Design a binder for these strands. Sequence first.
DNA 1: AGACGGCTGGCACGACTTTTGCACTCGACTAA
DNA 2: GGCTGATCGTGCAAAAGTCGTGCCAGCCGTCT
Lengths: 417, 49, 49, 100, 259, 259
Amino acid sequence: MKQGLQLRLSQQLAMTPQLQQAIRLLQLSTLELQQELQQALESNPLLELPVYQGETTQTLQDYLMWQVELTPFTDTDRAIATSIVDAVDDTGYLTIQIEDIVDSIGDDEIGLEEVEAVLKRIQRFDPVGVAAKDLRDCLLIQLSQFAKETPWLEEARLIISDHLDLLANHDFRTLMRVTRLKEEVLKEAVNLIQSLDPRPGQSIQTSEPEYVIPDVLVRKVSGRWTVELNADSIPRLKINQQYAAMGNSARNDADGQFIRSNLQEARWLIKSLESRNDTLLRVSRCIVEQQQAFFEQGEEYMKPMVLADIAQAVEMHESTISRVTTQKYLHSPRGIFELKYFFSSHVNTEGGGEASSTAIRALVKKLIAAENPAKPLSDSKLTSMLSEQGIMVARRTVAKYRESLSIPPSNQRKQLV
Amino acid sequence: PERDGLFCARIFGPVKDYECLCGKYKRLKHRGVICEKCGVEVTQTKVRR
Amino acid sequence: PDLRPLVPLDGGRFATSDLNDLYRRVINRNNRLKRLLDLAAPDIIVRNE
Amino acid sequence: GPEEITADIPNVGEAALSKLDESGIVYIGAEVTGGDILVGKVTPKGETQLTPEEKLLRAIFGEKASDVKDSSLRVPNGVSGTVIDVQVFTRDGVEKDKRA
Amino acid sequence: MAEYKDNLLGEANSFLEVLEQVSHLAPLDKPVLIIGERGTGKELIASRLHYLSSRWQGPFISLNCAALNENLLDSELFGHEAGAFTGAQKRHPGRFERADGGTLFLDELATAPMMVQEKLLRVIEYGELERVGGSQPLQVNVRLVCATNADLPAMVNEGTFRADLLDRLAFDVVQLPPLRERESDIMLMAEYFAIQMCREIKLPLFPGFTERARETLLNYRWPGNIRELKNVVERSVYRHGTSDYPLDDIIIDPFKRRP
Amino acid sequence: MAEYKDNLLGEANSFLEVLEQVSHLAPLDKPVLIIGERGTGKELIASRLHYLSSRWQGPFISLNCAALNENLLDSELFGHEAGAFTGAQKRHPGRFERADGGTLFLDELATAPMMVQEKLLRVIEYGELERVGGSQPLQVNVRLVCATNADLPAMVNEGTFRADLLDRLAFDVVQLPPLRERESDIMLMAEYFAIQMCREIKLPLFPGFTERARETLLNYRWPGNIRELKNVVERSVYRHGTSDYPLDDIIIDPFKRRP
DNA sequence: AGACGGCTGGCACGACTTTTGCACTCGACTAA
DNA sequence: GGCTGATCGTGCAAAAGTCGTGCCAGCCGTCT
Ligand SMILES: Nc1ncnc2c1ncn2[C@@H]1O[C@H](COP(=O)(O)OP(=O)(O)O)[C@@H](O)[C@H]1O
Ligand SMILES: Nc1ncnc2c1ncn2[C@@H]1O[C@H](COP(=O)(O)OP(=O)(O)O)[C@@H](O)[C@H]1O
Ligand SMILES: [Mg+2]
Ligand SMILES: [Mg+2]
């Protein structure tokens, strides 16, 4: 023969189609895969205390109920108070409106005056501003709770009344122009207003751990990184040995055929599961080989990664890689992150560098965190930082990353030092 | 709560609050109505026992 | 379910024991048997379950 | 997310925070009564939508945004005494080590 | 790109003069030629120049001329797009494309096909070319480097090479001095060799040569410019196998048969 | 690092001393060249050297300059990436890439094309190269082994061989002892061949070789040093038929008629 | 007090990714 | 006919999406 690249000849079809079982195996379903396996095992018959928590935390709902019971109120007043307690947000605000509350009361005798009186009684509770549903209202109640001997009290009340917009935009100059307040003397009042404990009802909420079960665990102790999947999380199916030892002995053709079909289906399913597990392990090993460079380089200097780049590291099609990456999580000493989180776009950099979008965002966030509070860093100013990094980037598109990190506008982030 | 199992909704009664599983009809305004996407009586939690 | 609390030991796993493990075993056994009952199993097998 | 000890506990006075050091531990040799906080740890909270109320609060207060919950360590009630020493253990792969 | 050190053990007036000329040449992006003989530090000089230039940020890539297969030399040079051939499944990056913006260190300039020279002629001169299946050519820019150990003018007189190709190639060619022409201390050069060899053989310390050994080393044909010195030194070190006494007799010629 | 004596014989001659010297070279990973005519156990020597290092655990392979398809040989040296040529089903790993970290034997170096010579010299122990249709270069580790029955210095003087390749190779030269001159080891080799044949022929016992056969063997020039010796031993054993008495005849030329 | 200036923010075209919707005819015969 | 049963089966591709980066229109802070 010879070596060449002629482009006209006969050929055959591509990979044979209708591999539905393999397609499901390629996708990772985690507990959903476990549920499907349980359903199949239900279908396939040849496949196989004294200590109690006893905690009655009030959660401030019971505390509110006890306060209502301990407080003197009419039967209608008690019912209104209970209804108000029903519509309370976790942060401490009222979810429903006063008109909504009146409508839910559904009483002609019930009036807006009674609702206001109940709210004042509701305001007359610990913590102050209970179910205020308005930041100014809760702040006003909290300020009214304190004594008037404190300095900058009337000015703080006036600001909370109708000067909230300027503070929202941090419009100190506009606020000074409007309210005609003393310059730089209002900084103390602003700090005191910042010391108002927003969302006082948040203390009611108690922390609950988030049960996250990883799939792959990596140690890399003393180097020698070795990817190991969660053996406990690894599914395992058993063949019914008693059922296996009853197929040949069967004298009924129908029973024998059913046993053979069930055995074949179970064998195919077990083979598919083992192949999926092996493919996942190989993909994890390849990623860890890629992630080892990323882990050593750190989050700030994470290298860009491509789906095709990883598919090259393996022997399966990129479709299998994409399917396996779905619902994929792993554990590392640095932390636990999704497998798809590894991939990132490559940003052309000075000297031809390709910059990971995630790493670029992390570095930009670190730089923005280390910024002067009086003068927030500008997006155009971020071009200077990028040039200092020695790597080219898209400052115009960097605003997208900044918003992605939920970074407020630099002008909006401006505040008195 | 799971579906048609132990510690499940639509059986054994409502959940910690009068709120329904589908997230709709979550208020004391509803006293005995049952939601559509999830079948839940809007009642107190203590009836679960 | 209220009288048989989950009682999370580590928080990650509730491990309902001495109350639901028997329930779980009987439930899955009955589901398997009833599903198999519609498939005309051999008499020996179905009698075993 | 991870839980960090940064001594930035909301809804608490500075008087309680006086005895706590930068990372949130209490200075060695200090004395404590009742249920005072020892170490200030917080639990990250799942993010919410734009939430104009929360967005406004962050534009006003910020630096918390209800992102965390008070999970600090405090003395059991009816217990008083003083600290002899403290010990911190950090697994490898994490190198915060503010004052470790 | 401020400072870099690599080998450069040779310290001769001619060696220094070449280094100084390269230093001035290093800023220039115009293509140049390296000349010399076998084992004449050719690889080192090219690498030093490549790091030296402002393309220190850019990728310096070399290429052996005779290595290319005649079957797909055009794809090797320019490249191909996906589907251009039957086997074309992706836009294969070109060698110049890989070096686009960088430095191309052509190797064995003499040892190339005439068709190869013809193919590469206009692209270097025009600075623009296209791969197989390309819509429009790419006019990338990259400094060009090439070398050969033969007398290019002799080949041109023989017509062995395209006169125009070399003509639009020889902006300030660079030559090398022979080992016999190398007046640098051969003993000093071999000192680093002895140190590295003692390290490699895990020997305690270099036993050192003798005055007669030094005189004989001076009295050497040295057809191999550097490697032969390195190779003969390594052979003598391996044969000696003892730091108890300094080296006095050195085996060089492999043709001779021992007793 | 095991004994693995395997086919170790003929120590009466200075081949034993040659093996002793090669034992020192066994830990070495530098270039290796072997000298000797065909039929001199050169492959056996190379195998012993490769096995000698615990790097025998590494991939030890052999290759001879058999052209086959020149393009195919070029690809095998280079390594065909997937889709490089029309119809390429998948990436074909290179012959060099197959054995990294382990010894590689290069044979028929005399019978190597000059273009093939240049291709090999491209990575002249350079250690890094690029695959056929390879995007980025790869660097591997392997100790090459060289052997030929021809006078490389002569061909270099003749210009047939590549002088740069010769310099890049043959850090050590292993000259095969003349088995035609190794008369003392001839008797021991005959005994070993007889033992092997008795293992193979499975007859009652070896009658012997008398002395006429030994005298004829002494008269025989034995152009095939180690290969033809065993072949003639087998042929004579077969022709002898009955093993009642020691055989004195010698099966010299099978091409010549038996009678 | 109107204009520069950087922000902001959506809209656009390339450039990488991606999910799902896909099973012949066997080798048994099958004979009316 | 009427599909009818069955070795043996580790993509793929193709239209779809989705992002990268730039590119223009408005806006307020401001100082001339
Ligand atoms: N100044 C130097 N410092 C160190 N090594 C040198 C120097 N000059 C030459 N060499 C040696 O010369 C060798 C390179 O020779 P080179 O001309 O590249 O071979 P070829 O002629 O086959 O291209 C290197 O192995 C290097 O050790
Ligand atoms: N010292 C020895 N002991 C045993 N067998 C040997 C010895 N030397 C050579 N041989 C054998 O002689 C045979 C012929 O050698 P030869 O034809 O030179 O092999 P090659 O040509 O592949 O190098 C070899 O197969 C080898 O096994
Ligand atoms: Mg060289
Ligand atoms: Mg051999």
